[PDB]
Design a protein around this ligand. Structure first.
Ligand SMILES: Nc1ncnc2c1ncn2[C@@H]1O[C@H](CSCC[C@H](N)C(=O)O)[C@@H](O)[C@H]1O
Ligand SMILES: Nc1ncnc2c1ncn2[C@@H]1O[C@H](CSCC[C@H](N)C(=O)O)[C@@H](O)[C@H]1O
Ligand SMILES: [Cl-]
Ligand SMILES: [Cl-]
Ligand code: NA
Ligand code: NA
Lengths: 318, 318
């Protein structure tokens, strides 16, 4: 039935995580035909249990049966590529620390404490936990870097970054966006503000240890907020934008690089629930960004689409 | 992409868990048109968070939008009933003790000590964990009872239990199968063997505190094993069937009431992986049931399909 298939959906995601996390996926590179017997011996997995997992992966369309051999479906080739967006998503969002948060989503909904499912599960915030977990931070950084790679060319095409001399990436993390921007836009002062244990050093990028909820440094022409605002409640988002305005002088701009909810959104609605589970965050309509900005003596000057999900929103002082 | 949609499938299951477990689904019974702001009050969930959940439930086809009101799709009407088989499956299968066990599935595959993901997660077997919490024992019981209520009509339509005078349900738990059977098949000696803290009292059904891995009592005409064999390794399944054979007089029968693996039997392939995660159990082909029976000193006498998933296998002395 439709309902039965929806209820048991999670088993498909868990099986794909096992396929990658156990190292099975490595053996399926370049459309290779794989003997399950030899695969069991290579990976140190019980033959019968591996054969049953392969039968499940065949049923859901990940693998294709070829008698005594199996192959990765050409539609799913990305699972054999560790640097593919899909492989990076599997290694991050299906990891135990993420997975286990979802079973506390109902409790979080009834609590009305503001505490997200992830915090109920782990007893600390997502970024507090990420700072304490080397492997999760590595998987997170790898995905962030891949997203930077995916959008950078379209971003440089639709927005003139050349007009700004001093650019601060607010919550820029490992700074992959400005790294890829500095490859094509030259002779600029690039800075990244985030929370660092050890301040990363990188030629052409100044890294600043700070807190954007308290203060943002003045003297920058462009302030960038990529995938930051959607982590926060309305009041905390307004606080960040108020702190941007306080840092800004006449002529300066804020550029939000954000998913945007739209009437015809499907992927964004799907992603919005993950933001609730991890952050008590949310994806916002343009009209919601309008109000947030207004409250911070800022105003939307322009909006452009990168793709189906991501838009850029230029703010100026109100 | 097909692959990205499979990776993020788990969010559908988690949203359904929130829909049922928070008590939201109640307000959608009998095809009711629901106002989300009004629903926000009756269930005490933040309007914005609830509206975002409902948007997600609309996207995946659980809810249908009717202007400024939402209904539960006819195909998913079972979710509005908190004691439906589907609602009880949702509240057990997607609850933390079971959901979080899937995080240890990869580790379980690489360890090869026969310990299921669930045991690695909780430091004890599924039935030990159930024994350690009276509430968790009881929730599983509500589900098993609804599954028995689901198939008893079809069982009674195709199999004559009237031909047997003394019937023992091996691992029959709270005895719901024999209670329902006793309404239609009267004048029988009914008995249930399981591991009890307090032996159930229910009219003149003989509830026996025992261990089917050690001994099965003699003097029954029919020995029933419903949804027992799939909980066990080949070795433990043979042990159970051998303990039946050791107790069986001439003319006595064993009736297996079990899911059976068949080509692209979706529900059974899906359940096979769940049985690995919970029990280091498995779903089996008819040929596999025949080998287990032959090793135990039993022969298959009759095979009948109850529905697309469930079959009955009658066994006699070899
Ligand atoms: N109070 C705070 N002050 C500064 N940075 C913060 C912060 N709270 C969270 N952050 C940072 O905000 C970022 C959110 S994730 C976005 C990272 C980056 N802009 C990208 O798009 O890839 C993280 O790097 C996190 O460390
Ligand atoms: N060693 C053992 N001896 C007896 N019963 C056992 C057992 N190990 C597990 N069981 C029982 O086996 C049952 C498996 S679940 C199936 C229950 C019932 N036949 C039904 O179809 O609804 C549980 O009731 C569990 O308590
Ligand atoms: Cl071999
Ligand atoms: Cl006989
Ligand atoms: Na791999
Ligand atoms: Na029973």
């Amino acid at each position: 039935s439709m309902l039965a298939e929806l209820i048991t959906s999670y088993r498909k995601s868990a099986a794909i995580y096992a396929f990658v996390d156990t190292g099975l996926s490595i053996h399926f590179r370049n459309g290779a035909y794989v003997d399950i017997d030899e695969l069991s011996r290579q990976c140190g997995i019980d033959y019968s249990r591996l054969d049953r997992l392969c039968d499940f992966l065949i049923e859901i369309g990940i693998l294709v049966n070829h008698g005594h051999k199996v192959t990765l479906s050409e539609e799913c080739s990305a699972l054999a590529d560790p640097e593919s967006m899909e492989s990076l998503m599997v290694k991050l969002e299906l990891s135990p620390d993420y997975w286990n948060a979802w079973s506390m989503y109902p409790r979080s909904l009834l609590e009305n404490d503001g505490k997200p499912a992830f915090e109920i599960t782990h007893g600390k915030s997502f970024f507090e936990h990420l700072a304490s977990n080397k492997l999760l931070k590595s998987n997170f950084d790898s995905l962030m870097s891949k997203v930077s790679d995916k959008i950078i060319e379209k971003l440089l095409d639709i927005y003139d970054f050349g007009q700004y001399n001093r650019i601060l990436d607010i919550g820029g993390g490992e700074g992959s966006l400005l790294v890829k921007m500095s490859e094509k836009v030259k002779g600029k002062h690039y800075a990244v503000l985030d929370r660092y244990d050890e301040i990363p050093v990188l030629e052409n990028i100044d890294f600043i240890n700070g807190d954007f909820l308290k203060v943002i440094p003045s003297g920058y022409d462009l302030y960038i907020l990529k995938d930051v605002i959607h982590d926060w409640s309305d009041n905390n988002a307004i606080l960040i934008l108020e702190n941007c305005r306080k840092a800004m002088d006449n002529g300066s701009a804020v550029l939000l690089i954000s998913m945007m909810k739209k009437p015809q959104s499907k992927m964004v609605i799907y992603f919005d629930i993950l933001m609730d589970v991890l952050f008590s965050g949310k994806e916002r309509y343009l009209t919601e960004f309008e109000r947030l900005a207004n409250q911070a003596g800022l105003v939307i000057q322009d909006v452009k689409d990168i793709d189906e999900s991501y838009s850029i929103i230029q703010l100026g002082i109100k």
